[PDB]
Design a protein around this ligand. Sequence first.
Ligand code: CU
Ligand code: CU
Ligand code: CU
Ligand code: CU
Lengths: 437, 433
Amino acid sequence: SPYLITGIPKDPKHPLPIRKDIDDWYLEQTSAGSNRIQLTLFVEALTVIQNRPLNDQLSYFRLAGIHGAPWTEWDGVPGGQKDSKGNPTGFAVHNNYTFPTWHRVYVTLYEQVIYEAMLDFIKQNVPQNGKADWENEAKQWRLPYWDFARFARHGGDELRLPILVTMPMVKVLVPGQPGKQLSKPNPLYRFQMQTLMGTLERPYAITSQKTEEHGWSFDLPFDKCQSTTKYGLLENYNADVWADGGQNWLRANLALNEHPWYQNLDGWDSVPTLQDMTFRLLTTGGLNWGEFSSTRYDDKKEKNWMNLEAIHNNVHNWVGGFMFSRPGRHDLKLWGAGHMSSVPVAAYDPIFWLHHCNIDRLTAIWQTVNSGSWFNDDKSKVSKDDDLRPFHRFCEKTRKVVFFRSDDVKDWRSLNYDYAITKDASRIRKEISDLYG
Amino acid sequence: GGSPYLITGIPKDPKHPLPIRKDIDDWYLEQTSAGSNRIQLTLFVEALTVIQNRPLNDQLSYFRLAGIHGAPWTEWDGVPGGQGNPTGFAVHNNYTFPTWHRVYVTLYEQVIYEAMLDFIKQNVPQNGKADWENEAKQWRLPYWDFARFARHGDELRLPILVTMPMVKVLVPGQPGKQLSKPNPLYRFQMQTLMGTLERPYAITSQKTEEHGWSFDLPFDKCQSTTKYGLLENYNADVWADGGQNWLRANLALNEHPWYQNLDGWDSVPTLQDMTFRLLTTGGLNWGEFSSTRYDAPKNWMNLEAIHNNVHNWVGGFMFSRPGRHDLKLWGAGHMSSVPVAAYDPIFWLHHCNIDRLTAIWQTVNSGSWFNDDKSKVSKDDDLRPFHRFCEKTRKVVFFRSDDVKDWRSLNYDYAITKDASRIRKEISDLYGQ
Ligand SMILES: [Cu+2]
Ligand SMILES: [Cu+2]
Ligand SMILES: [Cu+2]
Ligand SMILES: [Cu+2]
């Protein structure tokens, strides 16, 4: 501490490596041969990170803890912040125009920590004769994104959670034994502690989290979970079920394709699918940064398009499960609650980061086709210079440790990653239409 | 060694008269309450774990016991398999459906009891063995009451314990010490995909028909049993372990999408009401009650047909993508496919309740046993592969239906049939609308 966030260091041999679609990447790794070095690196590194203890601020628990509960210090920056309701809240920015830029830095922190763990894995497990090859793959690797708006391919018609997120086990290579493979628990499937999260040592215990459903208050029992869950917490179920409510990925996929938007869409031209809503986000002209970036711009919406943060909020609900209390009979098919729908605990679910990797990509796409729209309308200009706590960087012009600011990450390529879709500005509008139109 | 495995039920101890098979939710909630010693839950979990980890050449391994029902259609207890469509020992669509399965459930219960006794000998402090043995002697295979609304501190549900990936058990001799272990009731898995097991045990894909088209359900591509986790056009690495999608099973039980045509019925009954009608409709013979073979009647369904629907609703019965309105129930899994349903540990709990329903119906229809024109012909079929000792000729023979007419001869009962005076009131309390 401080942990200086840079993105993966620049290697002349590896100019601006790309964050790939995680389904494309999984099939590249597994389909056409056992080309599984990056998959092995990612699984083994994330496993190590998840098994680090609470007193290591680069453990998975503590990195996820930056976002929300248990609302503690990170990297020497104190907790104790409050939200608009006066409740304890995390460092994460929601309902402000820095929502995309705070999360841009957060995703880069996760990616960097993973890369550093990959290098340690290679130094510890790859024989001399394999080091350059394994190192080359780590240097090319970037955090994959989940394209929640792209139809899943068949070997498609359906939006889906990532293939790899739905697999309890994953097959990895044994370095030093070419040809040998092992099946291991998949660290992208879920995250769990070794006890119920409500009983962790102080100050890290996860409390229940109060949420409103149909205008009434419910205390979502995240203190009673050992594992993250998608849809597995239901009111008036035995708490031994809540300890690990499962990865109910079929219900998440149903919700993605039924797209039950929480906003009032009365008066809209149509009720768009998630793909169409995403298409409209990327192609609606004449929008400013404030309107694109946040639910703050127009309180009342919470004109036939929806901002980035609002879309993102719905996808959180649809992945995690947003109904703890039993609904009416006509809505029983989507009953259940889980981590991704609750801001205080969403970052514990490993899909959180893949979702935010695509939110970062959507931001980069929109920036590409809306050059100059950046914290400069009358509403968003005040936030431009906010410190993006708790994220530290080394300033080269002043030789100081400072917090990140939004202008530091306007060009995502300064963090040494890119997206295929943003490589060629002549192609981007066509690619948006191909994927989402 | 040329030693047939006699199926007797748990042996009789005069100080343990006719122990009862309990509702698995009541039993689990009792076992996990502070007023319980938790020993039966520990014993069941530890014993069933041992049984699941026995090797394939052990005919009392979980895999081989489940294999009696259907695929991979091998021998068991020296009785040849490989029975031109391949088929297993299980009786379906005949009037011995309930009695074949009565013996099968007893075999499972008895093997578990014997593994409990082994566990006690090897793991329990000497001074505790008597107490643990007495708990084993009280234990009987719990039933899943698929027609009873779950306790909620009106919804039918899979058992609590079936929906838990992990379960906490006692460490013998260490009060307060519990340890969390993989729950053997949650699923069954092998150490490789089931389609690659050593010959002759490999589990193949299995045909099914959906909307007039044949599909291969990819059970050969599964390492674990699944509920709803097999969907067409999903990467086969998902199929390795498609998950225990218990919310979708619960939805199916409460939406009750019967496979039968219900044209001209007075109402579409819920699963609870159909079960109520099974137990309370008078004037039916054994053949009408016992099997789909008899046929159809309206406003009533026979035991085997209710049981078939429950199999579908638990396992998932739609591999290929259905229409918009049915997407909420999309997905296929073991319990809907006869050749592989017995691998899912809930199979046995479902069949325990089908045995209980049979016992209840027998109690209130005591004159109807294999003695209508249709079912009489099946009465003396050998219930292969199950062996018993005949206490007259001093020989081992195959079970026959009449041997198990009185389920108490196998040294178990149900609370609801033990208290026969109350039975009609209890049926109304549990299942009446
Ligand atoms: Cu956030
Ligand atoms: Cu988010
Ligand atoms: Cu059967
Ligand atoms: Cu059955």
